[PDB]
Amino acid sequence: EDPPACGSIVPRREWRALASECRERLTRPVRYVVVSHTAGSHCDTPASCAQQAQNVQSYHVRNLGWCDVGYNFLIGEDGLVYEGRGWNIKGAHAGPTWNPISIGISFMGNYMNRVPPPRALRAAQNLLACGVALGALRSNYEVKGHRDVQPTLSPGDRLYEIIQTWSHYRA
Amino acid sequence: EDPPACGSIVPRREWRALASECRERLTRPVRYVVVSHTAGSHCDTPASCAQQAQNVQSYHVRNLGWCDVGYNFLIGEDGLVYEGRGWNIKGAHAGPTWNPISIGISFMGNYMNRVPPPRALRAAQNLLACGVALGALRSNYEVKGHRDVQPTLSPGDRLYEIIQTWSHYRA
Amino acid sequence: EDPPACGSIVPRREWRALASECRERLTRPVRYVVVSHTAGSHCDTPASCAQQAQNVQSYHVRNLGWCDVGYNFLIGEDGLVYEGRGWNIKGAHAGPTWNPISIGISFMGNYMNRVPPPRALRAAQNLLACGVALGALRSNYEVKGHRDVQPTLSPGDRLYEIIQTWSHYRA
Amino acid sequence: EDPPACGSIVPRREWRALASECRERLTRPVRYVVVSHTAGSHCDTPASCAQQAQNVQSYHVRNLGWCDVGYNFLIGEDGLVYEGRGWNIKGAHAGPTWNPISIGISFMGNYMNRVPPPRALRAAQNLLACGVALGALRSNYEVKGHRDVQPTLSPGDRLYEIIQTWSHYRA
């Protein structure tokens, strides 16, 4: 019955993604969101960012044999959100104790000592709002950094430092 | 926060806009939404699209002497929505009959023999969703094409073809 | 015509409030209002109510060592509103999830078996109308009982039946 | 190692706890213990209580949408201790400051003008004895009353006077 006003995702078909092989479903609503970086190249145009989208989905599939790209959603510095596993499918991104209960969104780039552009941040913040809108995320959603759920520098020092200032970031 | 789930709009601050000096308030709800095309050059990256937004505004302000870019919102092929006069300051896009009752959104470029990428069309359709969500737009909002309201060759044939598709398009 | 034309709040120095020490800021407009009750003694005179206000303030500041009384506004059965930490400061009234996105207004007294006098109710409704008139509260703001966001019998079975009857009540 | 036999707690599972979604952790050895009361109806048979324990959790997770019942343990007039969020997971019972450094045991009942039966008191002090032996509580933990750290009536008046008596109670 209910769409409260969503957000605009670049379909898999658009960034030319290999078909997903995953069947494991995330149980809806989800309470946690885990933010990370791909520690890969950055892209600032819709065109390069679709390339970036497929290179990451390919390390993940052709080299680690996962069923699809690890994250549920990706984020480009071009201000757009590329669709990964989406809101419904479980997705390898932060350890087995955390993959079944959270959504993983990953900024595409390495923000160890670089900050994402205001558009990247608006992209993500608005995505979560759409999530709450469809009811795929619960309004009590808690945003957690990846370093907060496992021994990794992700999502990078300078973007980590930033997500902490968000309304939903929890201890 | 543009209250609700306000679908990622690039702010005036960000595209380096000149201060609006517009004073007329839009009467709320804006039942009609008129689509047009600047009939100017187009842009596919956000960088090129900032500077394209600037161009449409200086022309409107320095040359025509208007209080600000005539459009409430400008859409780029970079798939982003650029803020102009916004949801409240009234626009200069369809003449006096329509200007005080409709919100006007323009696609950057001339769509006479060119189609806008689905990201542009997505960014537009999703911009109206944040419109309703805000109470800026009646949920039962009616989309008109420029031609429909004025003696004009815009949105451009191609873009006009498409908006007939839209569920909210009107006779 | 249209100015503030807000109701009439008894300011801090009028009831000898110790110096606020709070520095955290609510960002307006505010979307939510959480109705609480003090669960203490009630009062029906400007004199006794200004006394009550102070007790409640001290318990919260020396006993618990907080930076000021916890609520943003206190309603008295005398028919007046006692300025709590006001429209602009983040105040401790309903957990770390709501405190930053809501206004806490406590109805001095205990309302499990007791109804507040019309005065009280109007003092509270008035205060809210006023809050919108000032752009402190979002116009479509929502009212949620204290027990609707935290484990507590607050506001009192009887007051709770009352606020549920409001147009902004929405849980 | 030396058995530490204090365990005589009813598992989350003998009273049918819904699965918890909480994942934040207390650091052992925990220094503080906060005694609260549920302010709800009490129970005195292990059957009527397991119900009550489910009733409380239902409120916390289904209305307030919390990841699980907020207290770490619950005592009943039945003389039994109910596993809540247990010894290692951070509860939600006394606010942002206390939650991280304390355990919240809470008596199931309204002890405003009632005393809890001796068996409940025994079960509680025994429960604490447990914590120290397991190494979960510091050998010299400090008991604090719910109202001593937050604006409320808990642990109930007569029960508040009773704990003020204990040897680990502190200012």
Curated annotation (Swiss-Prot), chains A, B, C, D:
GO CC terms in record: extracellular region
GO molecular function, one term: zinc ion binding
Domain N-acetylmuramoyl-L-alanine amidase: 28-156
Disulphides: 6-130, 22-67, 43-49
Any GO BP: innate immune response
Subcellular location: Secreted; Cytoplasmic granule
UniProt entry keywords in alphabetical sequence: Antibiotic, Antimicrobial, Disulfide bond, Immunity, Innate immunity, Secreted, Signal
UniProt similarity note: Belongs to the N-acetylmuramoyl-L-alanine amidase 2 family.
Self-association and partners: Homotetramer.
Known function: Innate immunity protein that plays several important functions in antimicrobial and antitumor defense systems. Acts as a pattern receptor that binds to murein peptidoglycans (PGN) of Gram-positive bacteria and thus provides bactericidal activity. Forms an equimolar complex with heat shock protein HSPA1A and induces programmed cell death through apoptosis and necroptosis in tumor cell lines by activating the TNFR1 receptor on the target cell membrane. In addition, acts in complex with the Ca(2+)-binding protein S100A4 as a chemoattractant able to induce lymphocyte movement.
Protein name: Peptidoglycan recognition protein 1
Source organism of the structure: Camelus dromedarius (Dromedary)
